[PDB]
Amino acid sequence: FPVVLVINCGSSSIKFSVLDVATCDVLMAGIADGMTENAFLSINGDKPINLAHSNYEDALKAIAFELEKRDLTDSVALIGHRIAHGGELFTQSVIITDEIIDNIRRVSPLAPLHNYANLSGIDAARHLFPAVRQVAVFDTSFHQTLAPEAYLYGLPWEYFSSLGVRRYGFHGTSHRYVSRRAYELLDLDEKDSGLIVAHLGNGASICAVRNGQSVDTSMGMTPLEGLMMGTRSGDVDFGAMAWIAKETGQTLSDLERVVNKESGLLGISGLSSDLRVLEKAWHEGHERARLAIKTFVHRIARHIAGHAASLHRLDGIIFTGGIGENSVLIRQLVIEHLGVLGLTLDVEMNKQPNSHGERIISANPSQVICAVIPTNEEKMIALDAIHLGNVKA
Amino acid sequence: FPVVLVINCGSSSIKFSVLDVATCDVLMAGIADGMTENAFLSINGDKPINLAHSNYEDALKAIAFELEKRDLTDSVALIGHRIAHGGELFTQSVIITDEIIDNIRRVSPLAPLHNYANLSGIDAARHLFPAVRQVAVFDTSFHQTLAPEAYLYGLPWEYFSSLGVRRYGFHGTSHRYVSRRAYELLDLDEKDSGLIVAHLGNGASICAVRNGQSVDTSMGMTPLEGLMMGTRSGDVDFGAMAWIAKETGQTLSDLERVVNKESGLLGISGLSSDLRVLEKAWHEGHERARLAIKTFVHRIARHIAGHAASLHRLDGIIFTGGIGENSVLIRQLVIEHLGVLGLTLDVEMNKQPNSHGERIISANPSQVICAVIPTNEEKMIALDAIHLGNVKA
Ligand SMILES: Nc1ncnc2c1ncn2[C@@H]1O[C@H](COP(=O)(O)OP(=O)(O)NP(=O)(O)O)[C@@H](O)[C@H]1O
Ligand SMILES: Nc1ncnc2c1ncn2[C@@H]1O[C@H](COP(=O)(O)OP(=O)(O)NP(=O)(O)O)[C@@H](O)[C@H]1O
């Protein structure tokens, strides 16, 4: 009964899951949070244990003691680490060696906060589990098949050639996992196929998958580009930002905080980054929440259609992520916004809750199949780890 | 034989044309340039006359003397002024009164350089021609039919409500003129129709026209958003810009210059902002020019498709502007990039030079008619002026 421990270190937290190799089902999940004076560990969402001014190593030894307690330690056959940004260096998941680590550090200036937390998790896990093989899965690697016409910014070439300024894209692990599930669900030939995947969660992005490969995506060098999101602006006119700076004497630094933390659904609505709250507000007559949601919809539609340009044929549009999986209303309003693509909704199918899992929501006359496919990044990570567990290292 | 004098004041220049009312054809055109120690007036592209350290008033009195010399002065029945930015205040062209002027000044912080030159032209013309009716035609007014879901940025509401931060769009006069010509050329019912117009000139933008009204457009609060252009970046990840600032210690001000003046086709190519030079470079083996053009194409395709989302049906795609009118290659590569919309090119029609004027370039099996329609902003301005010449003021 081997298991895979999957580790995701964020700015201030370590999320983990333990996956049964046989079912790839989750056996245990948890978080060490406020990594702050108030650091705590909650497992299966329960009884926060207090951690000190604990660093990532201490917190992971804690998680490791929780596994020891449950007699899982010796079952840990593989450990998979989620890495935020792999640059142009990583095009697929890898066995972690010293070389891999040095290379993660090399790309780390592209996502300074996140990648340094990912490296702390790797260091801690290597120290705690030296005889277990560990694997790195990058949230950017699926997008490394974009052609330069799709990844270049229209900035001077030197920004690309000497600083790595280009579109990278994110949610790679979700877009990959969902597109693979789509070839089955839609019965498409992977090698002759065109899909658009809309990952709509707290972060949101669109990916165009042509013949199995990502050929366009909505997020940029950073996760700020593309779709408007919960608290993130999405696409914003650089001119407008510069004009706002001059007009308010905000520095680039102020503006960075605004567009990340105060914008999007929260910024428009004045109310919440949470979609269910904004729907309830709209039901109660709140016009700015209505407008926040309409705008969110419009931007999704606009990106889905624009990503279709990278395809030779459009076979399917797939919704995923917390919003994409659960919002009956978002889906319907997006699809109605894409009538120009010949889409038809089956409103019976569309009303089904997410307990129904992988499901077709377009009606028979539709020109493009529409579906909902729940994403499972943990599983995708465990699958790569299992595969890499068969090789010599 | 009345004529309309059409005036366009830029940052450093006054462009003008004199249009025969009867033919709406141009009788004379010219520029006062370097408005700099070296200020000169060239008419019909000829013999620069030297102007002093001449202000806009002096330069216009010069143009007026050139008209006096040719016995046109008393023919000037209308004067039309091109205004860069009308904010949310102007939804159509207007007879210039004191109120109009005050309102242009009110929106002028949105395009400080340009609108102040436009106001100088208006002041000068009012002083030189007090008994001639004058009309203001705004490059943003056609876009004032955008719904909030299409014009709002995902920024805090206060930026919109208290500073007018929203998408405005530009080339309005061209998008309007070309869409009107398209209903004739394509024999479409204006009231039940969906068009995408690609204005590809030095500046470039896309406009979606639904039932006669602009419902989406690619430029933003400023002309910097959207399509990559000659020297302008187009859409760029705000995160990438902030990262570049921090990494190079450039200020917002440096970056503003980069994305306006050093980016786009010039920035990628390292060579020219000029498309014909980049094509010649590509023919000679230059890979960065190839990449600049491919990227320009890709971004056009991506915006055309994304603007289609705002339409209930797509009937036509119309190319216009210097590039759109003359580049056989750009058109073909864009249309090939939109195969997913069921487009078919008639490569015989597409090869025709622009002397052929309004022309269909898609082939019979096409799902969407494709056309080239030369834009004529001077004419559109003169038509509004002529219409407004019939009213009481
Ligand atoms: N029934 C529902 N209706 C609408 N929104 C919902 C519903 N349930 C969950 N959500 C939304 O899901 C959003 C959070 O999405 P999330 O859980 O982040 O998906 P994800 O797959 O984790 N994407 P990311 O966090 O960027 O990797 C919140 O705005 C919730 O309101
Ligand atoms: N035969 C040609 N092939 C390719 N490009 C051409 C050709 N002729 C002119 N152009 C391009 O037209 C571009 C200038 O476009 P422009 O003359 O500005 O159109 P416009 O209608 O004035 N748009 P704007 O200036 O933004 O209002 C240059 O890059 C030229 O190379």
PDB file of N, CA, C and O in Angstrom, chain A residues 15-66, unseen atoms left out:
ATOM      1  N   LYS A  15       0.309  23.185   2.002  1.00  0.00           N
ATOM      2  CA  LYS A  15      -0.834  22.292   1.791  1.00  0.00           C
ATOM      3  C   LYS A  15      -0.296  20.902   1.456  1.00  0.00           C
ATOM      4  O   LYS A  15       0.733  20.764   0.743  1.00  0.00           O
ATOM      5  N   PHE A  16      -0.924  19.852   1.960  1.00  0.00           N
ATOM      6  CA  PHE A  16      -0.440  18.542   1.570  1.00  0.00           C
ATOM      7  C   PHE A  16      -1.593  17.587   1.429  1.00  0.00           C
ATOM      8  O   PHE A  16      -2.663  17.792   2.027  1.00  0.00           O
ATOM      9  N   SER A  17      -1.349  16.525   0.667  1.00  0.00           N
ATOM     10  CA  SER A  17      -2.251  15.441   0.545  1.00  0.00           C
ATOM     11  C   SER A  17      -1.462  14.179   0.470  1.00  0.00           C
ATOM     12  O   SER A  17      -0.339  14.108  -0.107  1.00  0.00           O
ATOM     13  N   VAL A  18      -2.057  13.143   0.996  1.00  0.00           N
ATOM     14  CA  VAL A  18      -1.471  11.833   0.887  1.00  0.00           C
ATOM     15  C   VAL A  18      -2.421  10.974   0.018  1.00  0.00           C
ATOM     16  O   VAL A  18      -3.611  10.827   0.365  1.00  0.00           O
ATOM     17  N   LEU A  19      -1.895  10.421  -1.061  1.00  0.00           N
ATOM     18  CA  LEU A  19      -2.676   9.703  -2.046  1.00  0.00           C
ATOM     19  C   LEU A  19      -2.267   8.288  -2.070  1.00  0.00           C
ATOM     20  O   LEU A  19      -1.122   7.970  -2.074  1.00  0.00           O
ATOM     21  N   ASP A  20      -3.293   7.469  -2.000  1.00  0.00           N
ATOM     22  CA  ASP A  20      -3.199   6.077  -2.100  1.00  0.00           C
ATOM     23  C   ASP A  20      -2.713   5.812  -3.464  1.00  0.00           C
ATOM     24  O   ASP A  20      -3.307   6.310  -4.427  1.00  0.00           O
ATOM     25  N   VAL A  21      -1.642   5.056  -3.609  1.00  0.00           N
ATOM     26  CA  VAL A  21      -1.239   4.807  -4.955  1.00  0.00           C
ATOM     27  C   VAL A  21      -2.304   3.997  -5.730  1.00  0.00           C
ATOM     28  O   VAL A  21      -2.465   4.162  -6.943  1.00  0.00           O
ATOM     29  N   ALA A  22      -2.966   3.069  -5.068  1.00  0.00           N
ATOM     30  CA  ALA A  22      -3.820   2.142  -5.798  1.00  0.00           C
ATOM     31  C   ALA A  22      -5.051   2.848  -6.375  1.00  0.00           C
ATOM     32  O   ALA A  22      -5.459   2.574  -7.478  1.00  0.00           O
ATOM     33  N   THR A  23      -5.691   3.704  -5.593  1.00  0.00           N
ATOM     34  CA  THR A  23      -6.932   4.344  -6.042  1.00  0.00           C
ATOM     35  C   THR A  23      -6.612   5.729  -6.601  1.00  0.00           C
ATOM     36  O   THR A  23      -7.474   6.356  -7.121  1.00  0.00           O
ATOM     37  N   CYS A  24      -5.361   6.198  -6.484  1.00  0.00           N
ATOM     38  CA  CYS A  24      -5.069   7.602  -6.480  1.00  0.00           C
ATOM     39  C   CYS A  24      -6.100   8.421  -5.697  1.00  0.00           C
ATOM     40  O   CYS A  24      -6.232   9.611  -5.980  1.00  0.00           O
ATOM     41  N   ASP A  25      -6.811   7.847  -4.723  1.00  0.00           N
ATOM     42  CA  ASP A  25      -7.682   8.666  -3.831  1.00  0.00           C
ATOM     43  C   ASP A  25      -6.908   9.270  -2.653  1.00  0.00           C
ATOM     44  O   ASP A  25      -5.867   8.765  -2.251  1.00  0.00           O
ATOM     45  N   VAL A  26      -7.412  10.378  -2.133  1.00  0.00           N
ATOM     46  CA  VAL A  26      -6.839  11.044  -0.985  1.00  0.00           C
ATOM     47  C   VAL A  26      -7.147  10.268   0.317  1.00  0.00           C
ATOM     48  O   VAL A  26      -8.320   9.884   0.590  1.00  0.00           O
ATOM     49  N   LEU A  27      -6.083   9.986   1.080  1.00  0.00           N
ATOM     50  CA  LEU A  27      -6.170   9.350   2.380  1.00  0.00           C
ATOM     51  C   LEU A  27      -6.142  10.350   3.505  1.00  0.00           C
ATOM     52  O   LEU A  27      -6.694  10.099   4.554  1.00  0.00           O
ATOM     53  N   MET A  28      -5.527  11.498   3.303  1.00  0.00           N
ATOM     54  CA  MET A  28      -5.370  12.492   4.364  1.00  0.00           C
ATOM     55  C   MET A  28      -4.980  13.779   3.665  1.00  0.00           C
ATOM     56  O   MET A  28      -4.265  13.745   2.654  1.00  0.00           O
ATOM     57  N   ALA A  29      -5.436  14.909   4.190  1.00  0.00           N
ATOM     58  CA  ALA A  29      -5.071  16.185   3.645  1.00  0.00           C
ATOM     59  C   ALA A  29      -4.936  17.140   4.812  1.00  0.00           C
ATOM     60  O   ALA A  29      -5.303  16.813   5.972  1.00  0.00           O
ATOM     61  N   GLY A  30      -4.358  18.288   4.552  1.00  0.00           N
ATOM     62  CA  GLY A  30      -4.030  19.201   5.655  1.00  0.00           C
ATOM     63  C   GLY A  30      -3.288  20.442   5.225  1.00  0.00           C
ATOM     64  O   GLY A  30      -2.896  20.602   4.064  1.00  0.00           O
ATOM     65  N   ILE A  31      -3.099  21.317   6.192  1.00  0.00           N
ATOM     66  CA  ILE A  31      -2.384  22.550   5.986  1.00  0.00           C
ATOM     67  C   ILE A  31      -1.675  22.973   7.280  1.00  0.00           C
ATOM     68  O   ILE A  31      -2.224  22.822   8.372  1.00  0.00           O
ATOM     69  N   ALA A  32      -0.425  23.403   7.133  1.00  0.00           N
ATOM     70  CA  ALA A  32       0.264  24.243   8.081  1.00  0.00           C
ATOM     71  C   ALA A  32       0.119  25.682   7.538  1.00  0.00           C
ATOM     72  O   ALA A  32       0.542  25.993   6.418  1.00  0.00           O
ATOM     73  N   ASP A  33      -0.529  26.540   8.325  1.00  0.00           N
ATOM     74  CA  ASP A  33      -0.908  27.898   7.885  1.00  0.00           C
ATOM     75  C   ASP A  33      -0.267  28.971   8.768  1.00  0.00           C
ATOM     76  O   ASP A  33       0.267  28.641   9.818  1.00  0.00           O
ATOM     77  N   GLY A  34      -0.292  30.232   8.319  1.00  0.00           N
ATOM     78  CA  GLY A  34       0.348  31.355   9.019  1.00  0.00           C
ATOM     79  C   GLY A  34       1.834  31.155   9.277  1.00  0.00           C
ATOM     80  O   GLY A  34       2.337  31.523  10.339  1.00  0.00           O
ATOM     81  N   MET A  35       2.545  30.572   8.312  1.00  0.00           N
ATOM     82  CA  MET A  35       3.916  30.088   8.563  1.00  0.00           C
ATOM     83  C   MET A  35       4.860  31.099   9.247  1.00  0.00           C
ATOM     84  O   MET A  35       5.491  31.950   8.609  1.00  0.00           O
ATOM     85  N   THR A  36       4.131  33.700  10.397  1.00  0.00           N
ATOM     86  CA  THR A  36       3.452  34.484  11.411  1.00  0.00           C
ATOM     87  C   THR A  36       3.662  33.816  12.770  1.00  0.00           C
ATOM     88  O   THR A  36       3.942  32.613  12.841  1.00  0.00           O
ATOM     89  N   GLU A  37       3.556  34.619  13.836  1.00  0.00           N
ATOM     90  CA  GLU A  37       3.638  34.138  15.215  1.00  0.00           C
ATOM     91  C   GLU A  37       2.651  33.006  15.378  1.00  0.00           C
ATOM     92  O   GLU A  37       3.020  31.943  15.855  1.00  0.00           O
ATOM     93  N   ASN A  38       1.412  33.236  14.938  1.00  0.00           N
ATOM     94  CA  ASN A  38       0.350  32.220  14.937  1.00  0.00           C
ATOM     95  C   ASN A  38       0.461  31.182  13.803  1.00  0.00           C
ATOM     96  O   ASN A  38      -0.365  31.200  12.881  1.00  0.00           O
ATOM     97  N   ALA A  39       1.456  30.288  13.860  1.00  0.00           N
ATOM     98  CA  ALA A  39       1.516  29.132  12.917  1.00  0.00           C
ATOM     99  C   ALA A  39       0.761  27.915  13.478  1.00  0.00           C
ATOM    100  O   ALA A  39       1.022  27.491  14.609  1.00  0.00           O
ATOM    101  N   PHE A  40      -0.172  27.366  12.698  1.00  0.00           N
ATOM    102  CA  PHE A  40      -0.927  26.157  13.087  1.00  0.00           C
ATOM    103  C   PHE A  40      -1.057  25.061  12.014  1.00  0.00           C
ATOM    104  O   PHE A  40      -1.090  25.358  10.822  1.00  0.00           O
ATOM    105  N   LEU A  41      -1.192  23.804  12.458  1.00  0.00           N
ATOM    106  CA  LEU A  41      -1.422  22.657  11.571  1.00  0.00           C
ATOM    107  C   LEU A  41      -2.801  22.044  11.759  1.00  0.00           C
ATOM    108  O   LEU A  41      -3.115  21.503  12.845  1.00  0.00           O
ATOM    109  N   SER A  42      -3.617  22.105  10.714  1.00  0.00           N
ATOM    110  CA  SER A  42      -4.925  21.438  10.692  1.00  0.00           C
ATOM    111  C   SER A  42      -4.945  20.269   9.705  1.00  0.00           C
ATOM    112  O   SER A  42      -4.573  20.458   8.537  1.00  0.00           O
ATOM    113  N   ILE A  43      -5.453  19.117  10.119  1.00  0.00           N
ATOM    114  CA  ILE A  43      -5.474  17.905   9.324  1.00  0.00           C
ATOM    115  C   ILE A  43      -6.875  17.374   9.220  1.00  0.00           C
ATOM    116  N   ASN A  44      -7.185  17.118   7.960  1.00  0.00           N
ATOM    117  CA  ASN A  44      -8.547  16.893   7.501  1.00  0.00           C
ATOM    118  C   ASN A  44      -9.510  17.941   7.994  1.00  0.00           C
ATOM    119  O   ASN A  44     -10.699  17.650   8.173  1.00  0.00           O
ATOM    120  N   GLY A  45      -8.994  19.162   8.157  1.00  0.00           N
ATOM    121  CA  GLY A  45      -9.799  20.319   8.565  1.00  0.00           C
ATOM    122  C   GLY A  45     -10.368  20.135   9.951  1.00  0.00           C
ATOM    123  O   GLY A  45     -11.556  19.841  10.117  1.00  0.00           O
ATOM    124  N   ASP A  46      -9.524  20.303  10.956  1.00  0.00           N
ATOM    125  CA  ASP A  46      -9.918  19.934  12.298  1.00  0.00           C
ATOM    126  C   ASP A  46      -9.304  20.817  13.386  1.00  0.00           C
ATOM    127  O   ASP A  46      -9.765  21.916  13.620  1.00  0.00           O
ATOM    128  N   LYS A  47      -8.261  20.323  14.037  1.00  0.00           N
ATOM    129  CA  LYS A  47      -7.903  20.757  15.353  1.00  0.00           C
ATOM    130  C   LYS A  47      -6.582  21.455  15.288  1.00  0.00           C
ATOM    131  O   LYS A  47      -5.561  20.895  15.695  1.00  0.00           O
ATOM    132  N   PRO A  48      -6.565  22.689  14.784  1.00  0.00           N
ATOM    133  CA  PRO A  48      -5.242  23.278  14.641  1.00  0.00           C
ATOM    134  C   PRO A  48      -4.296  22.938  15.805  1.00  0.00           C
ATOM    135  O   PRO A  48      -4.626  23.207  16.942  1.00  0.00           O
ATOM    136  N   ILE A  49      -3.168  22.294  15.512  1.00  0.00           N
ATOM    137  CA  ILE A  49      -2.063  22.151  16.453  1.00  0.00           C
ATOM    138  C   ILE A  49      -1.234  23.437  16.339  1.00  0.00           C
ATOM    139  O   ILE A  49      -1.047  23.956  15.230  1.00  0.00           O
ATOM    140  N   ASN A  50      -0.749  23.966  17.465  1.00  0.00           N
ATOM    141  CA  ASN A  50       0.055  25.185  17.454  1.00  0.00           C
ATOM    142  C   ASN A  50       1.474  24.856  17.050  1.00  0.00           C
ATOM    143  O   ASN A  50       2.068  23.943  17.596  1.00  0.00           O
ATOM    144  N   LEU A  51       2.020  25.589  16.088  1.00  0.00           N
ATOM    145  CA  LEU A  51       3.459  25.537  15.816  1.00  0.00           C
ATOM    146  C   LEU A  51       4.119  26.846  16.335  1.00  0.00           C
ATOM    147  O   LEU A  51       3.434  27.861  16.505  1.00  0.00           O
ATOM    148  N   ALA A  52       5.434  26.810  16.589  1.00  0.00           N
ATOM    149  CA  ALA A  52       6.167  27.921  17.258  1.00  0.00           C
ATOM    150  C   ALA A  52       6.184  29.194  16.395  1.00  0.00           C
ATOM    151  O   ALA A  52       5.156  29.574  15.813  1.00  0.00           O
ATOM    152  N   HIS A  53       7.335  29.871  16.340  1.00  0.00           N
ATOM    153  CA  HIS A  53       7.719  30.652  15.155  1.00  0.00           C
ATOM    154  C   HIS A  53       8.383  29.661  14.182  1.00  0.00           C
ATOM    155  O   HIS A  53       9.548  29.843  13.814  1.00  0.00           O
ATOM    156  N   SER A  54       7.628  28.626  13.777  1.00  0.00           N
ATOM    157  CA  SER A  54       8.169  27.453  13.046  1.00  0.00           C
ATOM    158  C   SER A  54       8.502  27.731  11.591  1.00  0.00           C
ATOM    159  O   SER A  54       7.712  28.321  10.861  1.00  0.00           O
ATOM    160  N   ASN A  55       9.667  27.276  11.153  1.00  0.00           N
ATOM    161  CA  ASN A  55       9.996  27.437   9.761  1.00  0.00           C
ATOM    162  C   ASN A  55       9.405  26.267   8.959  1.00  0.00           C
ATOM    163  O   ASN A  55       8.663  25.420   9.480  1.00  0.00           O
ATOM    164  N   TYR A  56       9.680  26.251   7.670  1.00  0.00           N
ATOM    165  CA  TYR A  56       9.095  25.247   6.820  1.00  0.00           C
ATOM    166  C   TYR A  56       9.599  23.864   7.253  1.00  0.00           C
ATOM    167  O   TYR A  56       8.840  22.919   7.283  1.00  0.00           O
ATOM    168  N   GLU A  57      10.874  23.729   7.600  1.00  0.00           N
ATOM    169  CA  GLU A  57      11.378  22.439   8.024  1.00  0.00           C
ATOM    170  C   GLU A  57      10.581  21.892   9.254  1.00  0.00           C
ATOM    171  O   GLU A  57      10.206  20.694   9.303  1.00  0.00           O
ATOM    172  N   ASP A  58      10.326  22.765  10.245  1.00  0.00           N
ATOM    173  CA  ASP A  58       9.706  22.361  11.547  1.00  0.00           C
ATOM    174  C   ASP A  58       8.278  21.883  11.285  1.00  0.00           C
ATOM    175  O   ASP A  58       7.846  20.855  11.807  1.00  0.00           O
ATOM    176  N   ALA A  59       7.566  22.693  10.506  1.00  0.00           N
ATOM    177  CA  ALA A  59       6.207  22.425  10.084  1.00  0.00           C
ATOM    178  C   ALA A  59       6.046  21.067   9.318  1.00  0.00           C
ATOM    179  O   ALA A  59       5.122  20.290   9.591  1.00  0.00           O
ATOM    180  N   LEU A  60       6.981  20.785   8.424  1.00  0.00           N
ATOM    181  CA  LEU A  60       6.996  19.536   7.718  1.00  0.00           C
ATOM    182  C   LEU A  60       7.322  18.317   8.614  1.00  0.00           C
ATOM    183  O   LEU A  60       6.804  17.218   8.355  1.00  0.00           O
ATOM    184  N   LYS A  61       8.205  18.517   9.621  1.00  0.00           N
ATOM    185  CA  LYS A  61       8.510  17.489  10.635  1.00  0.00           C
ATOM    186  C   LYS A  61       7.243  17.230  11.437  1.00  0.00           C
ATOM    187  O   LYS A  61       6.982  16.092  11.808  1.00  0.00           O
ATOM    188  N   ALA A  62       6.419  18.266  11.606  1.00  0.00           N
ATOM    189  CA  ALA A  62       5.145  18.112  12.279  1.00  0.00           C
ATOM    190  C   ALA A  62       4.205  17.258  11.467  1.00  0.00           C
ATOM    191  O   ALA A  62       3.578  16.308  11.995  1.00  0.00           O
ATOM    192  N   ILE A  63       4.091  17.603  10.189  1.00  0.00           N
ATOM    193  CA  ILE A  63       3.243  16.848   9.274  1.00  0.00           C
ATOM    194  C   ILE A  63       3.828  15.440   9.316  1.00  0.00           C
ATOM    195  O   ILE A  63       3.087  14.437   9.391  1.00  0.00           O
ATOM    196  N   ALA A  64       5.149  15.330   9.267  1.00  0.00           N
ATOM    197  CA  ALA A  64       5.735  13.975   9.245  1.00  0.00           C
ATOM    198  C   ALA A  64       5.398  13.152  10.516  1.00  0.00           C
ATOM    199  O   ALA A  64       5.167  11.909  10.444  1.00  0.00           O
ATOM    200  N   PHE A  65       5.303  13.844  11.657  1.00  0.00           N
ATOM    201  CA  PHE A  65       4.918  13.176  12.898  1.00  0.00           C
ATOM    202  C   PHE A  65       3.445  12.753  12.803  1.00  0.00           C
ATOM    203  O   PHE A  65       3.079  11.651  13.268  1.00  0.00           O
ATOM    204  N   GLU A  66       2.608  13.576  12.174  1.00  0.00           N
ATOM    205  CA  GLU A  66       1.220  13.159  11.976  1.00  0.00           C
ATOM    206  C   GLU A  66       1.101  11.884  11.120  1.00  0.00           C
ATOM    207  O   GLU A  66       0.291  11.003  11.384  1.00  0.00           O
TER     208      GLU A  66
END
